[PDB]
From a paper:
Following this approach, we have developed a microchip from single crystalline silicon with a periodic structure of micropores that serves as sample holder for several thousand microcrystals. To prove the suitability of our chip for protein micro-crystallography, polyhedrin and lysozyme microcrystals of less than 4 μm in size were chosen as test samples for X-ray diffraction experiments. X-ray data collections from both protein crystals were performed at the microfocus beamline I24 at Diamond Light Source at a temperature of 100 K with a photon flux of ~2 × 1011 ph/sec and an X-ray beam size of a 7 × 7 μm2 (FWHM) at a photon energy of 12.8 keV. The use of single-crystalline silicon and the efficient removal of the mother liquor lead to exceptionally low background scattering caused by the chip.
Residue numbers in the entry: 2 to 248
The structure:
């Protein structure tokens, strides 16, 4: 046989490149996943991830309470934190023993898989009682924030998209929903009658994941890197696996 890495008959090499290219392109096909991660960062350095993976479109919807840090199996002062909730839903509305709950997120990162179309991204960043813009009567139920999403590049490939905002002020008390639609450069509408019921089933079939990792390092190591997910850390370092046309 020919010698490795010297000719056009390195079929092992060609197969490796095709395998990676096939995965990249499968993900972008209408058969493929689109994925959404919402990261809530807490002052103790831990990070809650909410993830949903689904065909056609994907979303996550959280309220003020559900974004709060919960240390499973440890003390969370649940009565005091209910009083925090009461005091955040209406000023002077509760009697907790604290001015600022350390269970409040300090920041949010939203990451989409590379198979999203950024023009379809919508976000409802609402107030603490789940209204998009102060009062329902004046609220558009979402903002289209795609122009703010940064490309996560690795080796010149877009491995995902990130929108990051800090919540450093005392009044940054939010509710949050996010939605994105899978790429569809074809004119075949996946939700027109020929395929519409499959999109309804995709709502059933969407797989969700949630966990609180003790720090960003642990998240990078045992979540992001373990499962070939895109990520952008606090030092603006990019994580992901470039696949298209690559060995
Ligand atoms: N493209 C390129 N890569 C370099 C160069 N010097 C060092 N590198 C390293 O080599 C890596 C790319 O090597 P290859 O993947 O084998 O070459 P390629 O440019 O991708 O071309 P292909 O054979 O089509 O894959 C990069 O990740 C760089 O870190 C250079 O001058 N050009
Ligand atoms: N020293 C080099 N000279 C020429 N081309 C390179 C070199 N290093 C990488 N490249 C090529 O340039 C393209 C972009 O790769 P690069 O490593 O810059 O991507 P990146 O990870 O987005 O970069 P960075 O995160 O450092 O800004 C890739 O196709 C890669 O093969
Ligand atoms: Cl397709
Ligand atoms: Mg009292
Ligand atoms: Mg290469």
């Amino acid at each position: 046989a020919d010698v490795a890495g010297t000719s056009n008959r390195d079929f092992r090499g060609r197969e490796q490149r095709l395998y990676n290219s096939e995965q990249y392109n499968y993900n972008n096909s209408l058969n493929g996943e689109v994925s959404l991660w919402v990261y809530a960062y807490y002052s103790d350095g831990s990070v809650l991830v909410r993830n949903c993976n689904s065909q056609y479109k994907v979303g996550i919807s959280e309220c003020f309470k559900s974004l709060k840090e919960v240390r499973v199996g440890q003390n969370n002062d649940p009565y005091d934190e209910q009083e925090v909730n009461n005091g955040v839903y209406y000023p002077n509305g509760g009697e907790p023993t604290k001015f600022h709950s350390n269970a409040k997120p300090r920041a949010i990162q939203i990451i989409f898989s590379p198979s999203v179309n950024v023009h379809t991204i919508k976000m409802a960043k609402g107030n603490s009682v789940s209204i998009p813009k102060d009062y329902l009567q004046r609220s558009h139920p979402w903002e289209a924030t795609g122009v703010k999403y940064r490309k996560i590049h690795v080796d010149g490939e877009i491995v995902g998209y990130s929108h990051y905002f800090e919540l450093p002020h005392e009044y940054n008390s939010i509710s949050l929903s996010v939605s994105g639609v899978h790429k569809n450069p074809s004119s075949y509408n996946v939700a027109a009658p020929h395929n519409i019921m499959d999109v309804f089933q995709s709502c059933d079939l969407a797989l969700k994941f949630s966990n609180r990792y003790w720090c960003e390092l642990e998240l990078i190591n045992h979540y992001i890197s373990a499962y070939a997910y895109p990520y952008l850390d606090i030092n603006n370092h990019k994580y992901g696996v470039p696949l298209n046309g690559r060995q």
